[PDB]
Design a protein around this nucleic acid. Structure first.
Ligand SMILES: [Mg+2]
Ligand SMILES: [Mg+2]
Ligand SMILES: [Mg+2]
Ligand SMILES: [Mg+2]
Ligand SMILES: [Mg+2]
Ligand SMILES: [Mg+2]
Ligand SMILES: [Mg+2]
Ligand SMILES: [Mg+2]
Ligand SMILES: [Mg+2]
Ligand SMILES: [Mg+2]
Ligand SMILES: [Mg+2]
Ligand SMILES: [Mg+2]
Ligand SMILES: [Mg+2]
Ligand SMILES: [Mg+2]
Ligand SMILES: [Mg+2]
Ligand SMILES: [Mg+2]
Ligand SMILES: [Mg+2]
Ligand SMILES: [Mg+2]
Ligand SMILES: [Mg+2]
Ligand SMILES: [Mg+2]
Ligand SMILES: [Mg+2]
Ligand SMILES: [Mg+2]
Ligand SMILES: [Mg+2]
Ligand SMILES: [Mg+2]
Ligand SMILES: [Mg+2]
Ligand SMILES: [Mg+2]
Ligand SMILES: [Mg+2]
Ligand SMILES: [Mg+2]
Ligand SMILES: [Mg+2]
Ligand SMILES: [Mg+2]
Ligand SMILES: [Mg+2]
Lengths: 206, 113, 124, 152, 51, 97, 85
RNA sequence: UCUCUUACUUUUAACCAGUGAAAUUGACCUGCCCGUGAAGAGGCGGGCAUAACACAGCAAGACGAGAAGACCCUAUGGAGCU
RNA sequence: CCUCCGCAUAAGCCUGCGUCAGAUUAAAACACUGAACUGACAAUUAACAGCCCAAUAUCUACAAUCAACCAACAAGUCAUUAUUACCCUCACUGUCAACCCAACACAGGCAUGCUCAUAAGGAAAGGUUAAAAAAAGUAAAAGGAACUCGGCAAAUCUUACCCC
RNA sequence: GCUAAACCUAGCCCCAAACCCACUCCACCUUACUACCAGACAACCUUAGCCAAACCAUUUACCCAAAUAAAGUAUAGGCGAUAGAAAUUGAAACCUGGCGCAAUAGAUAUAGUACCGCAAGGGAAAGAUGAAAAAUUAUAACCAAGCAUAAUAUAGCAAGGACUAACCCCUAUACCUUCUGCAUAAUGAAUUAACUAGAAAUAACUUUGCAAGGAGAGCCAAAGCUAAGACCCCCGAAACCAGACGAGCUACCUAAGAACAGCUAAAAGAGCACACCCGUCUAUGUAGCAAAAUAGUGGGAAGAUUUAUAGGUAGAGGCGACAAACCUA
């Protein structure tokens, strides 16, 4: 869950704690770092879910949808577009099920596309005076909304039913706090009826 | 394990509760005595010349007739000034190497792009 | 050579070194003349548990609960929510005295009570 | 509680009361045969016998009769790849005995899975895998090496 | 005089992407066929125009 | 074997740099800027050798004099030993005496 | 690399840094006084220039002191301005 | 012990199967007699000998291998002692 | 078939032949699978032994050796009272192993109690042949030191003299 | 064709500028990582020496106030090796760099970690694919010593002249160093890859520039002055001094302990003889089981004995039933 990675550790289209990730780069390994474009956390525009357009590769010009961003190498993987082929089920006597897998593209090789006329377009982070922060097209001047993508919790809010050990909403927000100058200790000691009558004597701290 | 995220959820929920209770005690202590650090202590300089935050230890008799506390030495005794200077220079060398490597890495990035 | 790097635990020395070390448990008494241990009941910690019978609050929260901004409690906020209406009200009636602050919850010195705050009498 | 400085007991002082305790224990299945009332736990190092008695008699209302604890030595023999030793941690196991003639047997938590929901994100791929494996394994020793794809 | 070999590897792919992720594999086909076209038994016998 | 199998990447150098194009500008400043500055005041280097050629013994002596009050301890001891060794070398050993 | 300040100025820098800065200023002057003692264990020169034998040319003359060592018994009682040589 | 050695057993030893060192090594396709030679030759001169190659022994030679002779001499080199 | 070993305590080390899986590889001086191993899992539970004592004064000449005669010199290994204070009780630590010090799975070193040959504990021979040389043994015709610096070694038991 | 070979990039070096850091909770001077009790002891001290004087005995730059000049001048000095000022002059505020290294290089460093020693302390080695390894594909092959594909053919510093043919035929005393002289049977070297050894002055020569003047203050000058080029190695001792670390082996001592079967016991620093301590002689072993053992044979074994634990005496010394013996092989 909370594991520190080596200082020059490659990021490799698997999650960092996975099994084949521990297969690929074990803690023994030391290889050349991939020098990458440093990009601020305010200028990065494309998120995980919006439609994009590939500019160069084996299939330039086609549009598609990104499925993951790997920010440690400025990577995106568009859905089923920049693909190659690999066999999944493999044994010593049989291997088939040839399934296409995507290949990661840099952010320079990928342009965002506006839903009005559906062309690749350059973007500006034109901050709105009405409070919020949203992307704005340059050439046509249309607002590009951040798309709704299912969150990383693995859960959806609307069809969520409370279990036995899930507290209700109305009891999660009931304000019982009456602010007073007591500690928690003496408060629950007088709530529980516990009575202590003998004194704490002088003690020498040094 | 069936669902391992449940243990993480209970752990950081209890840490949120401990943080709330400690915040209430700390605000009440600032209003009543105006001191942070409910374990009282004092900046002292130990035998190796370092400056530390010594925490007090809640004894029964006062300090001047404590036999164990009077063997612990809180002073510098000037043969350690040379070793203090050497440690200072070692820290300066490490910081200089880090800053120069940052210079070089930024030059590599402006080289490639 | 002996093993320098592995830490010095209670299992390592001679027969006198074993027993004098311990593993970190806070003692609850004292040894008297005939090697007897006398437990003192006021030193062994008494767990103060409540009755959880009609309690309606679970170890998890429902995801339907809304979010809000975090605000850590500050001593000015505790002053404003605790003492400021009382001092404000009895100052409007002109009966407020700066001399006696003890009637609003202020304590001049912690030496009297049981749960004294700055030397931290209480355990946890 | 652990990692918390205890208030020193001057004689005739108040009762040391811990309110939000800090100890977390693990009921654990034994590795050897034990009698019917012995219930083996796994407790932190800073816990005593009397603390385990009051812990089980305050929170779970378990009537406890006798408690015996011991320290287990975690192994320190595994080397890393740079030959520095990796330390399995020490821990403290404790065996409580129930009081009033009660018995205890450790349950079986894992047997037995009976589940067959709809599968899309994992079992549709398993259905693809299994149907490809059921179809394509029709090799013939009488063809002798020829590919069985051409209708000719 | 204290050195060993390297390269513990395995030669069979497996099902890591459901072990946890939020990207599923984008297929472009299916496994088999929906319902098999059973041809007529005399298709070479009726290999002319019609009957 | 010592030789490399593949020839190295092409080393491309910009001859019309910023630094290469203005190299030697404000050199020759004293002659035709009526001698307000020396061309040795254009040198940017260590504070002891700015306009001074010197030996190896002379460079070490000048560095100890001009800077050795504020050097690090190990560097100062290494400079002391270097001056001791170079005195012993230049004034006792060699040919041509 | 090099230190910014020389090694012999770190004492005055420590005087200007922390609680030593909050000492009263006349104490700081009396501490940073650094004046010379009267001669005890040597005879000082009379003049500033002393014509010498073997060439009748005047030379500058200074008088340098003796590095005399004072044990702690000199701190316990009033000695002169004298100690061990 | 010897005149004067002999027989048997075990270890060792030879072959088979497994694992598997160390000193040494300028390169060698590495013979004998006489003579010569930095004065004691497998490599030089005159004669003689001469298909290639395994395995077990012996120690006449390789001025044999380990230790920049420990004996002799020198150093305007050391040290102990009187 | 051997046992001159073994079981414990102390000292030392710190999980170092318990289970499952890998044994495709890796150390087994070879292999099975396990002392020259990888990962995971589980154990050593105190009554045994450590960890102790409220003060101020005061007291303490007649050894031990079955302690009983006798007999000694090196003259010895063990003790309380008066007054005040004192009424709570079983907390903590060690407990595993085929193990320590010698670079090693080393014919070396290692304190005490117990049975002085065992109720414990183990295997000198990988298989074949019966060469030379070498080592350890057994036996030998007649002679018995004739060998050698010297009766060295071995075998039997062995007298007398001298120097220091 | 196996072992193999190849990689760039982690980082580092020298400068400039700038004065730099340190409690999340608990534990950490007693046996540090230990929650908890009555003698309170406490720091202030000229460095020495190797080395040069071709020995060595006074002597021998190292000292912490910016440069240049006066100047290597006055001075000091077995007046000798060498040491060496001062009066005085003046010292243009700001710029983020490399005719530096690239895994035997550069910090020792992936690290003061592994490993060695009781302790102070010593102290390493190494990694290389690709845009994608959620592409394990078929390539990419070619190159040191060493081997295999593929053992040998009479004769001889291994080769040369050749020749129709590899050999056969004629000629030929390996290299470096030290030497009057080496094939010498005088030293060094198994081989391959990488690393590993000429640093500078006064005075002279040449080439420019100026010229009785030269030089960007100071210094020289009866053709001189200024600038440049060109030129003086590496490894190796026994030793000396200063400060720390060592009595867990061993020499002795102190504290409180433990062991010594059986027989004859004359009474006993008595006799035979176990356990135990030591090691007279022989044999094996000599990179051995062992950096001092094994087997036999031996001396002591109720004492000046042996031994378990802790402490003490440390190098200009400790200790010593004097072996100039021992003080971590
Ligand atoms: Mg001859
Ligand atoms: Mg020869
Ligand atoms: Mg020889
Ligand atoms: Mg010699
Ligand atoms: Mg001479
Ligand atoms: Mg001499
Ligand atoms: Mg000498
Ligand atoms: Mg001496
Ligand atoms: Mg046991
Ligand atoms: Mg048996
Ligand atoms: Mg055999
Ligand atoms: Mg006979
Ligand atoms: Mg004879
Ligand atoms: Mg004879
Ligand atoms: Mg004999
Ligand atoms: Mg000399
Ligand atoms: Mg000389
Ligand atoms: Mg390196
Ligand atoms: Mg080759
Ligand atoms: Mg010939
Ligand atoms: Mg010749
Ligand atoms: Mg020579
Ligand atoms: Mg000669
Ligand atoms: Mg030779
Ligand atoms: Mg010679
Ligand atoms: Mg040789
Ligand atoms: Mg001793
Ligand atoms: Mg006797
Ligand atoms: Mg005897
Ligand atoms: Mg003696
Ligand atoms: Mg003598």
């Amino acid at each position: 869950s909370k594991v520190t990675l080596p200082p020059h550790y490659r990021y490799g289209m698997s999650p960092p704690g996975s099994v084949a990730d521990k297969r690929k780069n074990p803690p023994w390994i030391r290889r050349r770092p991939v020098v990458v474009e440093p990009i601020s956390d305010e200028d990065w525009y494309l998120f995980c879910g919006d439609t994009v357009e590939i500019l160069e590769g084996k299939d330039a010009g086609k549009q598609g949808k990104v499925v993951q961003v790997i920010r440690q190498r400025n990577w995106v993987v568009v859905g089923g577009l920049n693909t190659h082929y690999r066999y999944i089920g493999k044994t010593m006597d049989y291997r088939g099920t040839m399934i296409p897998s995507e290949a990661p593209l840099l952010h320079r090789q990928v342009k965002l596309v506006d839903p009005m006329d559906r062309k690749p377009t350059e973007i500006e982070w034109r901050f709105t005076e009405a409070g919020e922060r949203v992307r704005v097209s340059t050439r046509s001047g249309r607002i590009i909304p951040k798309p709704e993508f299912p969150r990383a919790d693995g859960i959806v809010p609307e069809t969520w039913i409370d279990g036995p050990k899930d507290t209700s909403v109305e009891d999660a927000l009931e304000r019982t706090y009456v602010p007073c100058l007591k500690t928690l200790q003496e408060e629950v000691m007088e709530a529980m009826g516990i009575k202590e009558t003998r004194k704490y004597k002088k003690v020498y701290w040094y | 394990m069936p669902s391992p995220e449940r243990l993480d959820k209970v752990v950081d929920s209890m840490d949120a509760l401990d943080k709330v209770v400690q915040e209430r005690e700390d605000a009440l202590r600032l209003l009543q005595t105006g001191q942070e650090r409910a374990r009282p202590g004092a900046w002292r300089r130990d035998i190796f010349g370092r400056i530390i935050w010594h925490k007090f230890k809640q004894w029964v008799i006062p300090w001047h007739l404590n036999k164990r506390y009077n063997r612990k030495r809180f002073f510098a005794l000037p043969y350690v000034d040379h070793f203090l200077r050497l440690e200072r220079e070692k820290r300066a060398r490490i910081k200089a190497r880090k800053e120069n490597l940052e210079r070089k890495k930024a030059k590599i990035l402006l080289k490639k792009f | 050579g002996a093993d320098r790097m592995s830490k010095w635990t209670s299992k390592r020395g001679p027969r006198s070194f074993r027993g004098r070390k311990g593993r970190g448990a806070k003692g609850i008494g004292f040894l008297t003349s005939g090697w007897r241990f006398v437990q003192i009941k006021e030193m062994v910690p008494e767990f103060v548990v409540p009755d959880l019978t009609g309690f309606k609050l679970k170890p998890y929260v429902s995801y339907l609960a809304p979010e809000s901004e975090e605000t850590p409690l500050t001593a000015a906020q505790l002053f404003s929510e605790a003492v400021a209406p009382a001092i404000e009200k009895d100052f409007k009636d002109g009966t407020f005295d700066p001399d006696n602050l003890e009637k609003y919850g202020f304590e001049p010195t912690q030496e009297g009570k049981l749960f004294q705050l700055y030397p931290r009498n209480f355990l946890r | 509680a652990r990692n918390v400085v205890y208030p020193l007991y001057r004689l005739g002082g108040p009762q040391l009361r811990v309110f939000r305790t800090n100890f977390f224990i693990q009921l654990v299945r034994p590795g050897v045969a034990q009698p019917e009332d012995t219930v083996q736990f796994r407790i932190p190092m800073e816990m005593t016998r009397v603390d385990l008695r009051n812990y089980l008699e305050g929170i779970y209302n378990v009537p406890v009769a006798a408690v015996r604890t011991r320290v287990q030595h975690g192994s320190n023999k595994r080397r890393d790849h740079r030959n520095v030793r990796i330390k399995k941690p020490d821990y403290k196991v404790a065996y409580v005995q129930l009081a009033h003639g009660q018995t205890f047997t450790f349950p079986d938590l894992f047997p037995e899975k009976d589940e067959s929901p709809e599968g899309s994100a994992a079992d549709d791929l398993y259905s693809m895998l299994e149907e490809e494996r059921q179809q394509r394994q029709s090799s013939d020793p009488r063809r002798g090496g020829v590919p069985s794809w051409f209708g000719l | 005089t204290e050195k060993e070999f390297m390269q513990h590897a395995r030669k069979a792919g497996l099902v890591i992407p459901p072990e946890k992720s939020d990207r599923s594999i984008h297929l472009a086909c299916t496994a088999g066929i929906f319902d098999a076209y059973v041809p007529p038994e005399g298709d070479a016998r009726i290999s002319s125009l019609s009957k | 074997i010592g030789i490399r199998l593949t020839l190295p990447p092409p080393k491309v150098v910009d001859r019309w740099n910023e630094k290469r194009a203005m190299f030697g500008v404000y050199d020759n400043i004293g002659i035709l800027g009526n001698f307000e500055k020396h061309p040795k005041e254009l040198i940017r280097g260590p504070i002891w050798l700015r306009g001074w050629k010197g030996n190896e013994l002379q460079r070490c002596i000048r560095k100890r004099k001009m800077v050795g009050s504020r050097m690090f301890a190990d560097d100062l001891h290494n400079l002391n030993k270097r001056i001791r060794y170079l005195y012993k070398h230049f004034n006792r050993h060699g040919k041509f005496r | 690399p090099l230190h910014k300040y020389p090694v012999w100025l770190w004492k005055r820098l420590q005087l200007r840094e922390g609680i030593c800065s909050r000492l009263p200023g006349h104490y700081l002057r009396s501490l940073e006084e650094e004046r010379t003692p009267t001669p005890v264990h040597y005879r000082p020169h009379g003049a500033k220039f002393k014509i010498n034998p073997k060439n009748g040319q005047r030379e500058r003359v200074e008088d340098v002191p003796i590095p005399i060592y004072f044990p702690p018994e000199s701190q316990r009682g009033l000695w002169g301005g004298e100690g061990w040589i």
